[PDB]
Amino acid sequence: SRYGPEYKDPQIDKEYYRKPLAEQTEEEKYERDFKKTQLIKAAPATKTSSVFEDPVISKFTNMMMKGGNKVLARSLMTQTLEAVKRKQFAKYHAASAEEQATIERNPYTIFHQALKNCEPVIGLVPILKGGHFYQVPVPLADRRRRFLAMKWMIAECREKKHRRVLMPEKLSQELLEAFHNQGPVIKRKHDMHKMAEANRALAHYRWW
């Protein structure tokens, strides 16, 4: 790490600076940020103040990347959002009056909602006691649950897809499947709940 302990993470949100007069405690926070003369790290290349970005997209885009092809990973994430948009637009056209104002045509809304349904609620961690390993359920933290949902999405669409079907279209199908709570990822989430509920009497082993 070329940054010393004094350097801190920069603040990028423009709206945080343009309307500071409506609050007092937050004003004391950033006025002392430079009054303490604390050094600020350089702005990361990925994050930007553009209003069209989203933090959950960047993390998902990074995991899709293999090697160092950020261009290819960004290209795949662009097509997948387009592919989802095309399918929802077509379904909207062929619908009745009541069905028309039900379909969502916002890929970002679909993407955010899809991952919030693939996150497990309670995980498992092996614990060694008496020379044997017992799968003990634990209340997984929010960051772990969010990361675990993304990994399951990538793992499924990389392994059990056909060789002919492209990556952007295969991932688009699973997002719609997870949006309706019927995708194989949702099945895997329930399977982890099945094992956690089966070993509900082993929760006493953990010591935290």
């Binding site: 940054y3 600020i40 350089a42 290349a45 103040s49 553009s50 950020k70 261009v71 960004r74």
Partner: protein, 328 residues
């Protein structure tokens, strides 16, 4: 070693006269800085250690401070605390404690007389006052100290400084005061330059990951950037790279109010894109008010990126990765 110092003093003055004689200058004003530049010329030592170069200075500054003789011919110690081992430190402690009692006695008398003419002068924040460092204190008492002894002495001064302050005590205390240099993170705003009927154009310099960017921004044109004689869209096909150039302008809501031409060399597509981003941030400080310049720093625009590629160690596959380690 009093005489040895005296011999060094007289010959250094004689030696300085010879140096001025051969240098052909005025010996009456052969200052130490002139001596250093003369020595560095006559004896051109190429060495990286700054302390290993030839030197000829005042022997008082060169030789370390020496303890004086502590006893007379009959053996009687001159000071009354010589048998405590550390006479200088404890005498300072004895005097410091005595001042506190005198202040307490003086304050007690003032309370009896119902007068409070003293004020707390401990607060020297605008001057930037800090207490003596242990190393500096050891060079003032000419005696070695310890961490426990130093902490006790400083805390005693705080008790002395927290009481009502007299004129004599403040002179005593201020000998232990040190002033920090000026601390500030404000940047120097480059004044606008006008050239050949050209109005409001500023220049910036940026560098990131083996890529230097030269950006000059005109405040009288429309929104366009000309990098290396070609349009920026053609030069930066990647959407992310063109997002980097947007980041400074979009933060100030001046996307279309400036005409720029750039010249960046070296590095890849992202290195140049980051370099041009840095150069615009520094070059745009002239057109922007001072308050938003601080906002620019808090967002990380104005700080150079120190992350550079590391070397490859001899005996490893890469910068950190080592070969496979077969245990058996």
């Amino acid at each position: 070693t009093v005489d040895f110092i005296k011999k060094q003093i007289e010959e250094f003055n004689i030696g300085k006269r010879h140096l001025a004689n051969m240098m052909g200058e005025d010996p009456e004003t052969f200052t130490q800085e002139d001596i250093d530049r003369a020595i560095a010329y006559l004896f051109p030592s190429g060495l990286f250690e700054k302390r290993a170069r030839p030197i000829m200075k005042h022997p008082e500054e060169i030789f370390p401070k020496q303890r004086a003789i502590q006893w007379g011919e009959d053996g009687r110690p001159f000071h009354f605390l010589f048998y405590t081992g550390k006479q200088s430190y404890y005498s300072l402690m004895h005097d410091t404690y005595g001042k506190l009692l005198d202040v307490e006695k003086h304050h007690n008398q003032l309370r009896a007389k119902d007068l409070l003419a003293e004020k707390t002068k401990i607060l020297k924040d605008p001057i930037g006052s800090r207490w003596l460092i242990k190393e500096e204190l050891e060079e003032m008492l000419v005696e070695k100290l310890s961490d426990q002894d130093y902490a006790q002495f400083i805390r005693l001064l705080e008790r002395l400084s927290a009481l009502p302050c007299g004129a004599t005590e403040e002179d005593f205390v201020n000998r232990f005061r040190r002033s920090i240099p000026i601390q500030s993170k404000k940047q120097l705003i480059e004044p606008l330059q006008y050239d050949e009927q050209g109005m409001a154009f500023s220049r910036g310099e940026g560098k990131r990951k083996t890529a230097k960017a030269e950006v000059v921004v005109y405040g009288q044109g429309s929104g366009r950037i000309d990098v290396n004689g070609v349009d920026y869209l053609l030069y930066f096909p990647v959407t992310q790279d063109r997002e980097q150039l947007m980041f400074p302008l979009h933060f100030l809501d001046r996307l279309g109010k400036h005409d720029m031409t750039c010249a960046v060399s070296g590095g890849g597509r992202s290195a140049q894109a980051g370099a041009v981003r840095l150069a615009m941030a520094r070059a745009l400080c002239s057109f922007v008010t001072e308050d938003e310049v601080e906002w620019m720093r808090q967002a990380g625009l104005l700080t150079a990126d120190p992350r550079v590629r590391e070397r490859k160690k001899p005996g490893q596959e890469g910068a950190r990765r080592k070969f496979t380690w077969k245990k058996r």
